[PDB]
Amino acid sequence: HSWFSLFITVTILVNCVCMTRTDLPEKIEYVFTVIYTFEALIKILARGFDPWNWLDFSVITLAYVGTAIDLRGISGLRTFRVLRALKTVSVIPGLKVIVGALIHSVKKLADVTILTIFCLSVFALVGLQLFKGNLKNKCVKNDMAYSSHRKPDIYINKRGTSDPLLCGNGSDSGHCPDGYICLKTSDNPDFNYTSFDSFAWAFLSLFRLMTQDSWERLYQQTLRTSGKIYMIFFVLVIFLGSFYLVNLILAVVTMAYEEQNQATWVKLKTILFGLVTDPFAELTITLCIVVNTIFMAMEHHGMSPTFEAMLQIGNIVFTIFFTAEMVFKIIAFDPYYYFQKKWNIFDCIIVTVSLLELGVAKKGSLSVLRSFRLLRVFKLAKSWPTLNTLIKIIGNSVGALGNLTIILAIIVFVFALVGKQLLGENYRNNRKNISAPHEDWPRWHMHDFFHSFLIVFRILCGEWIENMWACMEVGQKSICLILFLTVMVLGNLVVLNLFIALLLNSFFADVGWQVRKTCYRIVEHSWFESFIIFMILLSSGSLAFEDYYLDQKPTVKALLEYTDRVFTFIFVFEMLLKWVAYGFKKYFTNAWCWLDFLIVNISLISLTAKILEYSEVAPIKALRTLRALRPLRALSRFEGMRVVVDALVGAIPSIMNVLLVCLIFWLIFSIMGVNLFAGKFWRCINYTDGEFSLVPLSIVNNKSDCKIQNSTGSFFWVNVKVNFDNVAMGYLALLQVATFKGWMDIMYAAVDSREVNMQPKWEDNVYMYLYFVIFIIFGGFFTLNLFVGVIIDNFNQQKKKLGGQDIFMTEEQKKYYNAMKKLGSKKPQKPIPRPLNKFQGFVFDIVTRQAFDITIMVLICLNMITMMVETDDQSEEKTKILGKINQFFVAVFTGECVMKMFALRQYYFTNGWNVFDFIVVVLSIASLIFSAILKSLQSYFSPTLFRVIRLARIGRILRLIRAAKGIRTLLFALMMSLPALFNIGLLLFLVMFIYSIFGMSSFPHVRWEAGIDDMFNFQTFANSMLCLFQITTSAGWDGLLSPILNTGPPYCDPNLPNSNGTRGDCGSPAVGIIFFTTYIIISFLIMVNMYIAVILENFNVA
Ligand SMILES: CCCCCCCC/C=C\CCCCCCCC(=O)OC[C@H](COP(=O)(O)OCC[N+](C)(C)C)OC(=O)CCCCCCC/C=C\CCCCCCCC
Ligand SMILES: *[C@@H]1O[C@H](CO)[C@@H](O[C@@H]2O[C@H](CO)[C@@H](O)[C@H](O)[C@H]2NC(C)=O)[C@H](O)[C@H]1NC(C)=O
């Protein structure tokens, strides 16, 4: 009956929340059981008058019997309860269609994994070959004076961290300080879980790199242990590893999703005067909203009392005005008509909350309620189409797409509860191992439901491997692997499905004339143009020599002085020649000649100051910094870069408007964050030597007390570098949370936040995490959907304007594209003629059959399996046996190739696959003899090159893609899309170079802190390039911004004994803030364009 079902639905709802709650008093569960056994009895009576329900009854009876002996315990009983409690949730009419839709998504992704795991295995084998046992390298002290190791190996900790320092014996690897030599130890960096020593560890590391979870940490470790050059590895892999796989995941799901939805008296006078309401009143309302917004966006830590009083008076006046509009409108319409509109109820509730706050006015009382007035900006949407669109996206997410949100929330809840129950006792009895040095609890644990939900949400943000390391050290490793991997895969699947759906559904539902002629002819000629291109390239390249060490090279500096003056003379003459050749009107109406003119003007001003006695003046020294804009002249010449920039310029107008709405939305969040956290991020630290430790609340609980106890001089009252004290800084804080780098530091301070001038306490405001959660869900998450949708429809309209012509490719790249497209479609090639000779004919008969081909593939698979068993520090005998096996394999493949050549004389060389195995065979033979000759008869070179010589066995592995249809097709799609990626990568390389010049001139001095160390700094072109590549993907950009945000002790030496240029260990916060933010935004736009190009390419191929 209906009443029976409703009883069942409510009791299970009680359990959802009942398990969410710990410390059951063993009285709630009993009251629940009495009820469930009565329901089971009546169900049995009905049944006499499904097997799963029968099994549930058996489980409950088993628990009833088990209360006497070994009560509770094990782990599984609670997890068995939740499945039964979850069936009712699953029964919702709409959820079943959605999960059926999702199964198709995993069936479509099938082909992608076949290729994803193949690529991960191949690059994991490469990484195993190159870096096995290199992450075990550590800086070990020497001895003064022999049995085994002299005492325990005393390592050193890198500045600012407790981790042992990783070094190398190479020139570009990394070196130990004085009194320290590199030794390969037995312990690996993180928890002995980060390595390249075996195929399992290498596969885990490559999977971490594919998702880019803290990948910059592994980047630095391997480049510090092996050498800077191996960054190229990490470059080639990172792009294909993350970018390419996402290209497929998205396309392969997006089409699939589209597929399915392609299948489907005085009162009368008051009423009159209220109806008298005219458009001149609406403008007043909007004006009041804007002025209130700007007044509320004017709060900061350092407000004067008069400043605060004026803000308070203004806020009251506005609240009175809005209450006035309420009382006018209610007695203008009727309240039944009034309370029928959707916006009227919203206005009513906001102003009611505002009046309630005006009533109970305590300093800090429910500050969240003081920011609901900000919601009134949403009323500024009936005239702004974009804000309305954002609201439509959210409403579509809630109402029409509600089932996806429900399944995502249920997945998060179920997995958090399951992990809490399985792993919970472990995080309390083992908490010492995974906690920070001076803390007594891990910051991310699973003892209680809130923290389990936080860990699940953080995994949904892409940060899972560190928490996995923490849990594998506290509990069972297999449980961690299963839990974290399933959570990550399943949650990312659901989130991408929700995101793509929302975009697709909401968004898409007389002598002078002769001289002029001669000059024009001279300019038009191609040699002149090539000369100018060559000069631009040389001018750009010379800028890459002006690093921190130029002052030590006396000749180089002088050479550049001449190089820069002669180049300036060249371009001024070139401008003069063009001016005479084209004419003034044509020149000054070109939009490229203006760029050349401005750059030449800057260079000429710098040179004129250099010749004069104004080289040291403040503004000229700032124009000298704009010598990094010279490479843009190269962008002018090259046509691919011109095409890409033209697209960027066409897109810009829409990104302007979308950007404005994002700023308005963030401004709301920043005002809320200032209301909550402004001035509460200050805390005392003990700074002794490059390391700061938070002063404990026992000895010092108050600001004043640090001054009282500062006998040593080591105690400093400091504020977090990025904070909500100021609204502008708040946007930077929000940006870090949206990027997901540096988001944690801001959050920990907010959770520890207490009253102003009060020492922060461990997790005293633990429910402030929710605020950040809401931001991530509503701000970055909603805005990014709008941003992507706007970019997509802009792309569609622009390509339709072209006539559908593909953008990002030059005209000759179009011809290459057409030829490459025609290549892939030709089926017939004709049968190859049979050999006339009996012996050649017999070899032909042997080689032509499919059995030979299958035998060759299974042999290569065996070779692959033989290659997966290589491990660091394995044995001598194992190495010899593997070498003999490799010799047998190479002999077999050599013989096979010879047989093929005999059977197929010229037809062999005709096919490209045949050319490819021939090349791999020759490479393997050359590798095998080469390695032997240096060892046998030549001076012993570095072993690390041998590790590179044996990289010729991977070609035999890549021979397999001959057989697989999906992988071959995907590879063909990538090949087709390469030409446009070339131009976009050229633009990205130019941007990186310019930024490197800007960083190498503006940031080399900065104290080594956080990301900035002896290898990743801005003192050299290569060092800046490494930093730029790392932040290209936004990884670890807060780590480089942090040292630049330092403006005094204990992080700076006010004047310093040795620094003429900046006179400090100080970095420029405005420049750094501007420099880092601009690059990430530009890189994000470029990478979005690359996504668009390759996904369109995949769609055309499919
Ligand atoms: C920041 C970044 C810095 C720079 C990063 C470096 C960028 C490197 C970029 C790309 C490198 C790989 C790209 C080329 C892949 C070529 C694969 C290939 O060209 O094959 C596919 C074709 C397909 O032919 P289909 O009949 O199936 O038509 C397909 C039927 N439809 C029309 C439906 C598709 O096959 C053929 O053309 C047969 C003729 C070709 C035979 C030799 C070609 C294969 C040689 C090597 C391939 C190994 C690729 C390894 C990729 C990484 C793996 C870990
Ligand atoms: C800062 O905090 C400390 C500790 O709470 C305050 O010192 C206490 O003040 C009360 C006042 O009745 C005494 O009874 C306690 O014995 C004091 N404890 C001490 C000495 O730590 C201190 O007054 C607060 N104010 C300042 C100076 O900022």
Ligand SMILES: CC(C)CCC[C@@H](C)[C@H]1CC[C@H]2[C@@H]3CC=C4C[C@@H](O)CC[C@]4(C)[C@H]3CC[C@]12C
């Ligand atoms: C708690 C605060 C910060 C979040 C924002 C307030 C939310 C929860 C409330 C306040 C006013 C409410 C809106 C008032 C108007 C309507 C009626 C109908 O047309 C759709 C729902 C909708 C649009 C409501 C959605 C939820 C709503 C926006």
Ligand SMILES: CC(C)CCC[C@@H](C)[C@H]1CC[C@H]2[C@@H]3CC=C4C[C@@H](O)CC[C@]4(C)[C@H]3CC[C@]12C
């Ligand atoms: C019918 C066809 C045209 C619809 C195609 C929808 C495509 C273009 C949508 C669906 C999902 C979207 C992607 C979702 C996530 C990201 C990651 C972000 O960092 C770059 C943009 C990118 C890559 C989006 C680009 C646009 C996108 C790929």
Ligand SMILES: COc1cc(NC(=O)c2ccc(-c3ccc(Cl)cc3)o2)cc(OC)c1
């Ligand atoms: C080397 O080739 C490239 C790889 C990437 N790869 C990425 O993996 C990535 C992930 C997240 C982001 C990203 C996220 C947020 C912001 Cl604000 C900026 C960037 O980028 C991106 C490239 O674009 C230039 C080029």
Ligand SMILES: *[C@@H]1O[C@H](CO)[C@@H](O)[C@H](O)[C@H]1NC(C)=O
């Ligand atoms: C580094 O070189 C020193 C000799 O300078 C040597 O003793 C040490 O073992 C080397 N370490 C490695 C792993 O190369």
Ligand SMILES: *[C@@H]1O[C@H](CO)[C@@H](O)[C@H](O)[C@H]1NC(C)=O
């Ligand atoms: C934590 O360290 C203790 C030693 O204090 C050790 O016994 C235990 O095994 C460690 N944790 C785990 C999960 O092994």
Ligand SMILES: *[C@@H]1O[C@H](CO)[C@@H](O)[C@H](O)[C@H]1NC(C)=O
């Ligand atoms: C704090 O500073 C003192 C020196 O004044 C030092 O001796 C002590 O070890 C430091 N402690 C911490 C917590 O870093």
